[PDB]
Amino acid sequence: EQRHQEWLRFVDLLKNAYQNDLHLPLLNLMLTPDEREALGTRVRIVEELLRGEMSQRELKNELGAGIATITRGSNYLKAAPVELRQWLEEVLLKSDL
């Protein structure tokens, strides 16, 4: 329960950092290179899962990512609220015909 408040304090700190144009150095302080790389790759995974055109072998090759992480992210995406999903489709699939 207190872990939850601690998480929310991070969320609020980062909100305020974006407001003050300090988000880039804050994220450089708070995340390791491997975590930042994972987040960048997760964006690409979410995009391709929302697109829904690739097979599992194709996802692995296109994304340079492992099946275990793709599988878990797909469940997180399934569980996401439609308010978020529709916004992500708008953003991450913005070029798709």
Ligand X SMILES: O=C(O)CCc1c[nH]c2ccccc12
Binding site for its own copies (CB under 8 A): 3, 5-11, 13-18, 20, 22-32, 35-37, 39-44, 46, 72-73, 76-77, 80-81, 83-84, 87, 91-92
Q: How far is the CB of 44 from ligand X (least distance, A)?
A: 9
Residue with Cβ nearer its own copies (32 or 55): 32
- Cα 32 vs. chain centroid, distance in angstroms? 16
d(CA 48, CA 73): 11
d(CA 1, CA 47): 32
Residue with the CB atom nearest ligand X in the bound state? 73
Identity of residue 74: S
Q: How far is the CB of 21 from its own copies (least distance, A)?
A: 9
- Tokens of residue 46, six digits: 């979410």
62 interacts with, out of its own copies, ligand X, none, CB within 5 to 8 A per kind: none
Q: Nearest-CA neighbor of 73 among 53, 43, 51? A: 43
